[PDB]
Amino acid sequence: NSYPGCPSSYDGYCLNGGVCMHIESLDSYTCNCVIGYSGDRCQTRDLRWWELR
């Protein structure tokens, strides 16, 4: 099932358009940024993704 999202205990570590992923079994957790979101987690919201388009 992979259970999309992540233990609500989170609801705050993923930054700027950071998809909160959740691998089952190992009940571990992670995140993913995008085309304008990077840096540590994804605090890098710069002139890229949105580009004000």
UniProtKB/Swiss-Prot annotation:
<protein>
    <recommendedName>
        <fullName>Epidermal growth factor</fullName>
    </recommendedName>
</protein>
<feature type="domain" description="EGF-like 9">
    <location>
        <begin position="2"/>
        <end position="43"/>
    </location>
</feature>
<feature type="disulfide bond">
    <location>
        <begin position="33"/>
        <end position="42"/>
    </location>
</feature>
<feature type="disulfide bond">
    <location>
        <begin position="6"/>
        <end position="20"/>
    </location>
</feature>
<feature type="region of interest" description="Not required for full biological activity">
    <location>
        <begin position="48"/>
        <end position="53"/>
    </location>
</feature>
<feature type="disulfide bond">
    <location>
        <begin position="14"/>
        <end position="31"/>
    </location>
</feature>
